[PDB]
Amino acid sequence: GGGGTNSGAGKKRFEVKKSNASAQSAWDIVVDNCAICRNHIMDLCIECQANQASATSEECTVAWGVCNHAFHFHCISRWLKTRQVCPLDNREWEFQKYGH
Ligand SMILES: [Zn+2]
Ligand SMILES: [Zn+2]
Ligand SMILES: [Zn+2]
């Protein structure tokens, strides 16, 4: 057998914060808010806060997903109306608990 070469320092070139585009990455997905409207969990939705929801303003509508997801029931219902899969998981959405 044998060994490798000895890593020598001093061959360092000065690095520059240099990127073609400022969009290095996106932001992580959160279930403590409704990603669909991008409003806080179990609270008022997009328009709904401006709209003046007439039921509960504490919570417009919320539903939990078996897939460890949390969205607004309103938002997820519209989503499901057009899509069969989670906006985040890209897996078929399943209702854990929604209530009404
Ligand atoms: Zn929502
Ligand atoms: Zn709503
Ligand atoms: Zn899911």
Examine the secondary-structure arrangement and name the CATH architecture. 2-Layer Sandwich
Distance between the termini: 71 Å
Q: For this structure, what is the CATH class?
A: Alpha Beta
Helix content: 10-25%
Count of helical regions? 2
Instruction: Give the SSE string.
Output: EEHEEHE
The number of strands is: 5
EC number: 2.3.2.27, 2.3.2.32
Subcellular location: Cytoplasm; Nucleus
Pfam family, one: zf-rbx1
Family: Belongs to the RING-box family.
Give an account of the 3D structure.
This protein is of the alpha+beta class and 100 residues long. It has a single domain (1-100), classed as Herpes Virus-1. 16% of the residues lie in helices and 13% in strands. The chain contains two helices and five strands; from the N terminus they run E-E-H-E-E-H-E. It has helices spanning 46-51, 73-82; strands spanning 33-34, 39-40, 63-65, 69-71, 95-97. The strands form two sheets. A three-stranded antiparallel β-sheet has the order 4-3-5. Strands 1-2 form a two-stranded antiparallel ribbon. The protein is elongated and about 70 Å long. The structure holds zinc ion (3 copies). Residues 34, 36-37, 39, 45, 72, 75 line the site of one zinc ion. One zinc ion (ZN) is lined by residues 45, 48, 53, 60-61, 74. Its EC number is 2.3.2.27, 2.3.2.32. This is E3 ubiquitin-protein ligase RBX1. Pathway: Protein modification; protein ubiquitination; Protein modification; protein neddylation.
